[PDB]
Amino acid sequence: LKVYNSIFDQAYEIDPIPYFNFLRKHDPVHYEESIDAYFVSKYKDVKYILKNNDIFNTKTLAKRAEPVMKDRVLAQMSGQEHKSKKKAILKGMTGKYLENLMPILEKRTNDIINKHIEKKEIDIVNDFGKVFAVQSSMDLLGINLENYEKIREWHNGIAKFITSFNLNDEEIKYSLECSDKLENYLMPLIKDRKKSTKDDLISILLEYKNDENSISDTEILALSLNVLLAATEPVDKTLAYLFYNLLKNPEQFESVKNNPKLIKNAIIETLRYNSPVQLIPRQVSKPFIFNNTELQAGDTVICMIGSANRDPEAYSNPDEFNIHRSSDNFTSHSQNLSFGTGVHTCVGASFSLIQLEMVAILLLKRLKNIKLKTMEITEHGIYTRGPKSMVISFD
- Binding positions for heme b are 282, 344, 346
Question: According to the binding rule CB under 6 A, does residue 339 interact with ligand HEM?
Answer: yes
Name 57's bridge partners.
Answer: 283
The C-alpha atoms of residue 367 and residue 175 are separated, in whole angstroms, by 38
- Contacts with ligand HEM by CB under 6 A: the residue count is 23
On whether the CB atoms of residues 387 and 379 are closer than 8 A, the answer is yes
Given its phi and psi angles, is residue 369 left (phi above 0), alpha (psi -120 to 50 degrees) or beta? left
User: Which residue, among 120, 148, 113, 165, has the nearest Cα to 300 in the 3D structure?
Assistant: 165
The enclosing H or E element of 392 equals: strand 391-393
Nearest-10 crossing angle of helices 148-162, 130-141: 100
Q: Does 204 bind ligand HEM (CB under 6 A)?
A: no
The one among 86, 116, 248, 373 contacting ligand HEM by CB under 6 A: 86
| Residue 306 binds ligand HEM (CB under 6 A) | no
Judged by beta carbon, residue 309 or residue 394, the one nearer ligand HEM is: 309
Stretch near ligand HEM under the rule CB under 6 A, chosen from 14-22, 185-193, 231-239, 255-263: 231-239
Distance CA 375, CA 349 (A): 30
Residue 143 touches ligand HEM, criterion: CB under 6 A: no
Q: Which of 226, 245, 252, 334 binds ligand HEM (CB under 6 A)?
A: 226
With contacts defined by CB under 6 A, name the span among 7-15, 102-110, 206-214, 272-280 that binds ligand HEM: 272-280
Residue 276 touching ligand HEM (CB under 6 A): yes
Using the rule CB under 6 A, which residue among 16, 157, 340, 381 binds ligand HEM?
340
Instruction: Find the binder of ligand HEM among 60, 179, 338, 384 (CB under 6 A).
Output: 338
Instruction: Pick between residue 226 and residue 245 the one whose CB is nearest to ligand HEM.
Output: 226
Q: Which of 23, 29, 49, 230 binds ligand HEM (CB under 6 A)?
A: 230
Query: Are 39 and 16 a contacting pair, CB within 8 Å?
Result: no
Shortest-Cβ-distance residue relative to ligand HEM: 348
Helices (H), the chain: 10-14, 17-26, 43-50, 59-69, 80-91, 95-116, 130-141, 148-162, 169-195, 201-207, 217-247, 250-258, 263-273, 305-308, 349-366
Query: Per CB under 6 A, does 60 bind ligand HEM?
Result: no
For residue 385, state whether it binds ligand HEM (rule: CB under 6 A). no
Q: Which of 102, 117, 206, 346 binds ligand HEM (CB under 6 A)?
A: 346
- SS3 call for 344: coil
Beta strand pairing call for 37-40 and 300-304? parallel
Q: After which residues is the chain broken (C to N over 2.5 A)?
A: 329
Interaction between residue 241 and ligand HEM (CB under 6 A): no
Determine, following the binding rule CB under 6 A, whether residue 231 of this chain makes contact with ligand HEM. Answer: yes
Residue 74 touches ligand HEM, criterion: CB under 6 A: yes
Residues in touch with ligand HEM (CB under 6 A): 74-75, 86, 89, 226-227, 230-231, 234-235, 238, 276-277, 280, 338-340, 344, 346-348, 351-352
